[PDB]
Amino acid sequence: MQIFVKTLTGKTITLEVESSDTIDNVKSKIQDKEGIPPDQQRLIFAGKQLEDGRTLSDYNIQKESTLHLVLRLRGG
Amino acid sequence: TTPKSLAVEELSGMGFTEEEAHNALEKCNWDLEAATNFLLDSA
């Protein structure tokens, strides 16, 4: 199964994962893919942010799902 | 298109209406990333 990540810059990313993949893994893939800071980028689906550690089945993440990637940003 | 509406449009296609995205953006200072971050943490 593959996922379509959407950056807030207008870039589409197609990643290849399994039914046993995890969020944390997706982030690393994107980092080695383009270079988006892992400590900033965050996975989102249906509005709900995918908590790092859990799998894709815990969020009913279907196939070819439209995932989003938003940075943590700084405002302290 | 207009930036103000452009942000609300992109945000409307994530999981929330244009209304929620509108308030989020404005307050966050019409910032897109901050808006999404609002719907993420801010509640």
- For B1-43, the fitting CATH number among 1.10.8.10, 1.10.580.10, 3.40.50.300, 3.30.428.10 is 1.10.8.10
DSSP conformation letters of B1-43? --HHHHHHHHHHTTTS-HHHHHHHHHHHTS-HHHHHHHHHT--
Handedness of CA A4, A50, A24, A40 (dihedral sign): positive
Method: NMR
Chain A interface includes B1 (CB < 8 A): no
Chain B interface includes A37 (CB < 8 A): no
| Cα B19 from Cα A20, distance rounded (Å) | 36
Task: Select from A8, A48, A49 the Cβ nearest to the Cβ of B33.
Answer: A8
| Cα A75 from Cα A62, distance rounded (Å) | 34
Fold of A1-76: Ubiquitin-like (UB roll) (3.10.20)
Task: Select from A42, A44, A73 the Cβ nearest to the Cβ of B14.
Answer: A44
| Cα A57 from Cα A22, distance rounded (Å) | 9
Handedness of CA A36, A6, A45, B16 (dihedral sign): positive
Domain boundaries, chain A: 1-76
Chain B interface includes A5 (CB < 8 A): no
Q: Angle B18-28/B3-12 helices, nearest 10 degrees?
A: 130
Q: In what order do the strands lie in the sheet with A48-49?
A: A12-16, A2-7, A66-70, A42-45, A48-49
Distances in Å between the alpha carbon of B35 and those of A40, A69, B9, B29, B38?
15, 13, 12, 8, 5
